[PDB]
């Protein structure tokens, strides 16, 4: 019935000292039936990252759409798109379907290549932008994520520290959600490098 | 919005745009087709206004419309593509609705229709193309060879040629093709074809391509050597006299 509770899944992004982290579970189910444990919800265009929760088919479609748009962008602008600009592109793209929206909960994360300033943002299915300075949550366990984040989070964490925090937030929220879990992946992002780590969690 | 009548009648009863369309065909590289007793062969000549091409990728002159039918042409290359695409689309549609692939005459009648239509529709010029379509009707072994022209007229031939110097090569075929005993072999058929082209290609091993179409989707193109070998055996027939 609710397009956003069919496939399940979660995404969470956090800002730290000269870095940002975006994490997600790997589950894809059909209500109670688990179907895939390798459905990643994080994608990237250049140095900009996008995680999408919600109806899987729309998650796939949106990624393909933004890949398409960011490619043409690079060809014309002759530069990779930035976090702030991409956020605007996401918002306007979603609102364009105001009365027949994609059932998704997007999350943007990245570092501005020119200002070095960390950036994260969330959106509702029709484009409303939420530009938090701390964290952003999305998915079937978003209430749980809000709980984890509001308590675990603190400003200016170093990459190695933010990793522990974002991971514990993700993992413990997913274990209180029937439709989330079955694997997890965390992205630690810095101006120069990006590390991707798969976590070990329950498989039930 | 553009709908100017470009193809109209002139006082003497002619439609010049269709007439000039033919002139573009005369200017195209020669194409020939001859049907054997159990096959059909299509030969085309290769221009030489410029040579330094990449033969692997450069578009070939014979095109498969389906697994059992091929089409060759003389005239505007860009124009032929449009007809080929439509023909290929119509071939799949036919299979989807009738649950049987097109017969060669059906596919021919379709291409011809598209051509005729472009001679009496506003805002468009006729196709500067003429085609030779050959293959075998589904579950049939009797060879088929048809020809279409800008006007939209079509018909079947035992053997036929189109393009520049087609006048010459047609004569060759008219006094070298016996309906009583058609090239009973894939080999002697391909030979008669090469022979007719040599009357106009003027020594062109790499300027002559051949494709052999047999029953049940058995279609294959010969390599330079395979053809070059035919040429060799042919120049001897002459010298040995």
């Amino acid at each position: 019935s609710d397009p956003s509770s069919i496939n399940g899944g979660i995404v969470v992004a956090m800002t730290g000292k000269d870095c940002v982290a975006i994490a997600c579970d790997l589950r894809l189910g059909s209500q109670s039936l688990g179907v895939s444990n390798k459905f990643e919800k994080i994608f990237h265009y250049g140095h900009v990252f996008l995680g999408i929760t919600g109806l899987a088919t729309d998650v796939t479609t949106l990624n393909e759409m933004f890949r398409y748009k960011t490619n043409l962008y690079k060809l014309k602008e002759e530069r990779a798109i930035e976090p702030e600009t991409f956020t605007q592109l996401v918002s306007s793209s979603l609102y364009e379907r105001r009365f027949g929206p994609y059932f998704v909960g997007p999350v943007v994360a990245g570092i501005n290549s020119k200002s070095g300033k960390p950036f994260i943002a969330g959106f509702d299915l029709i484009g409303c932008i939420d530009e938090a300075k701390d964290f952003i949550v999305s998915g079937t366990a978003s209430d749980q994520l809000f709980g984890m984040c509001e308590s675990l989070y603190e400003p200016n964490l170093e990459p190695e520290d933010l990793f522990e925090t974002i991971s514990q937030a993700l993992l413990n929220a997913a274990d209180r959600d029937a439709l989330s879990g079955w694997g997890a992946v965390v992205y630690i992002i810095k101006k120069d490098e990006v590390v991707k780590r798969y976590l070990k969690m329950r498989q039930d | 919005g553009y709908d100017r009548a470009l193809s109209i009648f002139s006082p003497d009863g002619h439609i010049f745009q269709v007439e000039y369309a033919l002139e573009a065909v005369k200017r195209g590289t020669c194409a020939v087709g001859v049907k054997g007793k159990n096959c059909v062969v299509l030969g085309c000549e290769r221009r030489s206004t410029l040579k330094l091409q990449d033969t692997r990728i450069t578009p070939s002159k014979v095109s498969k419309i389906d697994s059992h039918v091929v089409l060759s042409f003389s005239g505007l290359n860009a124009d032929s593509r449009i007809l080929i695409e439509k023909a290929r689309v119509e071939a799949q549609s036919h299979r989807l609705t009738l649950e049987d692939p097109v017969t060669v005459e059906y596919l021919t009648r379709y291409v011809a229709g598209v051509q005729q239509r472009y001679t009496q529709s506003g805002g468009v010029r006729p196709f500067g193309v003429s085609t030779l379509i050959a293959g075998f009707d589904p579950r049939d072994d009797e060879p088929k060879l048809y020809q279409t022209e800008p006007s939209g007229i079509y018909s079947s031939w035992s053997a036929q040629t189109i393009g520049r110097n087609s006048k010459t090569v047609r004569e060759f075929l008219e006094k070298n093709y016996d309906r009583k005993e058609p090239p009973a072999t894939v080999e002697e058929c391909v030979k008669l074809t090469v022979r007719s082209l040599l009357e106009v290609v003027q020594t062109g091993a790499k300027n002559i391509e051949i494709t052999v179409v047999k029953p049940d989707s058995d279609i294959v193109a010969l390599s330079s050597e395979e053809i070059n070998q035919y040429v060799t055996q042919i120049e001897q027939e002459k010298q040995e006299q």
């Binding site: 496939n7 894809l28 059909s30 039936l33 179907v35 895939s36 390798k38 459905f39 109806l55 899987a56 088919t57 796939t60 479609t61 027949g100 | 498969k64 419309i65 389906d66 697994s67 695409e85 290929r88 689309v89 071939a91 799949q92 549609s93 299979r95 989807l96």
Partner: protein, 198 residues
Amino acid sequence: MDIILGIRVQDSVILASSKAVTRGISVLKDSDDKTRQLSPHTLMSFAGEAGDTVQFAEYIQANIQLYSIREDYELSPQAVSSFVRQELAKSIRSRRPYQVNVLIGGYDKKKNKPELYQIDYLGTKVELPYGAHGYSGFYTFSLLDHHYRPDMTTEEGLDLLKLCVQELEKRMPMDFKGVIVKIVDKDGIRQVDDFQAQ
């Protein structure tokens, strides 16, 4: 719904699909082949709404065959599945959506590896070692989760499926009248005419 199963072993993909076609109170046919060959090395099985099912399958088949002729090339299984996913993802937001679920089994001659794709009517695509649509997964996935191995032979895959079908024939309420099985490998697509008692 009908039984649509698929398993990807070492060098091939196997699709098993129920043969029954039930309309209301009666089983109208018990020899229905719920499959369409999209290309020499790609097979698609399907289940769903009465007429949409075959209309969609044949529509996709027509498109792939047209591409093959135009390019004188066979699209990779991955390419074919993305084309199919897009078609379904368009349909889901149209006037009357195609209510069809599919399994696409293909052997990629370039990578020399078999591939199995599961796509539901919403355009939800996932690649898997084995998959199914409907309730089929509910009875068989516990068996596949147990006995599945990436290095299985085609013969081992057929034995595992046989086990799955037996579980289905024991616990499922409906009589689906057995299944037709097809193998897709480096040499093409062939049908196991002997599964009625393998």
